[PDB]
Scaffold this active site. Structure first.
Site, short mmCIF file in Angstrom:
data_model
loop_
_atom_site.label_atom_id
_atom_site.label_comp_id
_atom_site.label_asym_id
_atom_site.label_seq_id
_atom_site.Cartn_x
_atom_site.Cartn_y
_atom_site.Cartn_z
N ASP A 48 4.94 -9.04 4.03
CA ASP A 48 4.48 -7.83 3.38
C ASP A 48 3.74 -8.10 2.06
OD1 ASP A 48 4.79 -4.70 3.34
OD2 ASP A 48 5.20 -5.36 1.29
N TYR A 53 -1.08 -6.63 -5.37
CA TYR A 53 -0.35 -7.85 -5.72
C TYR A 53 -1.31 -9.00 -5.99
CZ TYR A 53 3.38 -5.29 -3.16
OH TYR A 53 4.26 -4.33 -2.67
N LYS A 78 -1.63 -3.08 1.89
CA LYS A 78 -1.61 -1.70 1.41
C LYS A 78 -2.86 -1.34 0.63
CE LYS A 78 3.40 -2.29 0.73
NZ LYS A 78 3.47 -3.75 0.35
N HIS A 111 -0.30 3.00 -0.29
CA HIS A 111 0.73 2.40 -1.15
C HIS A 111 1.61 3.45 -1.83
CE1 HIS A 111 1.57 -1.58 -3.54
NE2 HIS A 111 2.67 -0.86 -3.41
#
Ligand SMILES: NC(=O)C1=CN([C@@H]2O[C@H](COP(=O)(O)OP(=O)(O)OC[C@H]3O[C@@H](n4cnc5c(N)ncnc54)[C@H](OP(=O)(O)O)[C@@H]3O)[C@@H](O)[C@H]2O)C=CC1
Length: 283
Positions: A48, A53, A78, A111
């Site tokens: 994931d 990120y 996401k 998200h």
């Protein structure tokens, strides 16, 4: 009966591995590459990540490094809050795909819905994002589509306009925030629930009751929580950058929590979040 074999079948028939590696707060570069490589070598089949990120290239590199064929691995990423909208969602998806170095993505998620104040000023841009997800799915660019951090009311908004029902809702879920009411709703609508911060970002691991339950089985508190996730039929994605913890977390298919233990873990709920409330977020 194993980390590589436990699956949850989504409403469109796609088999998503029940257990995955989360990579939030794993630094881009070597740390993420290793964590991903170690997970896959230990039998994880699901990673994931997320655009925000900023470690999607590293996820891709770690997958390639592992030697495990891309077709055996489930990749979730996401759409970030600032890129919601129809054309902007298509563009963001393509950016993730190119960073991952893949031809298709397994699961793509909105998200966050964004907080109520932003929704009031800017409108529910998650709806037009969902329309973009539907087009991406139609074009076979993504195998499954879903959302993250949606409450029942956000889900009702999508359900009122959708041609494809969201297949997953990934939300903060752990023994202090069990999401019972959202799970009941998602079950009704065939939306699989996936737990983020399942170990409570690490803060739950000193819990007396959890550790004591674990001791009965020669397991750690983390292993008890994740076994609880599995027995509640949830998808779970614990994060670690440490090889030993990555392997430990996956070693939960050699025991089972009895009825009383499950009851004791369920009693821990206080509806307490470590993460932002999706309704109140100022982002
Ligand atoms: N949709 C969303 O908005 C969100 C999604 N997520 C997803 O969920 C994933 C998991 O949630 P996350 O908040 O990262 O954290 P977790 O609940 O998995 O807890 C992570 C923390 O626990 C530590 N840890 C992990 N395993 C063990 C173990 N066996 N023993 C002791 N300590 C351990 C890690 O340390 P260390 O790494 O140093 O080993 C880290 O500090 C994220 O990585 C992300 O993929 C997360 C938040 C929001």
């Amino acid at each position: 009966a194993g980390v590589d074999k436990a699956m949850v079948t989504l409403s469109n028939g796609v088999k998503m591995p029940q257990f995955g590696l989360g990579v939030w707060q794993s630094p881009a570069g070597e740390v993420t590459e290793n964590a991903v490589k170690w997970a896959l070598c230990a039998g994880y089949r699901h990673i994931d990540t997320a655009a925000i990120y900023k470690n999607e290239e590293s996820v891709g590199a770690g997958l390639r490094a592992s030697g495990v064929p891309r077709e055996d691995v489930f990749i979730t990423t996401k759409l970030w809050n600032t890129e919601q909208g129809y054309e902007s969602t298509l563009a963001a998806f393509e950016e993730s795909r190119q960073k991952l170095g893949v031809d298709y993505i397994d699961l793509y998620l909105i998200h966050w819905p964004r907080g109520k104040d932003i929704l009031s000023k800017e409108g529910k841009k998650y709806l037009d994002s969902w329309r973009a997800f539907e087009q991406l799915y139609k074009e076979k660019k993504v195998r499954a589509i879903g959302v993250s951090n949606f409450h029942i009311h956000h889900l009702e908004d999508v359900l009122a306009m959708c041609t494809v029902t969201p297949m997953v809702n990934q939300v903060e879920l752990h023994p202090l925030n069990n999401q019972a009411d959202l799970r009941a709703f998602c079950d009704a609508k065939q939306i699989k629930v996936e737990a983020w911060s399942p170990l409570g970002q690490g803060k739950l691991l000193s819990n007396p009751i959890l550790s004591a339950i674990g001791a009965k089985y020669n397991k750690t508190a983390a292993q008890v929580i994740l076994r609880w996730n599995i027995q509640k039929n949830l998808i779970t994605i614990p994060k670690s950058v440490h090889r030993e913890r990555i392997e430990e977390n996956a070693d939960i298919f050699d025991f089972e929590l009895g009825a009383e233990d499950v009851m004791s873990i369920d009693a821990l709920n206080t509806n307490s979040r470590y993460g932002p409330d999706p309704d109140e977020a100022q982002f």
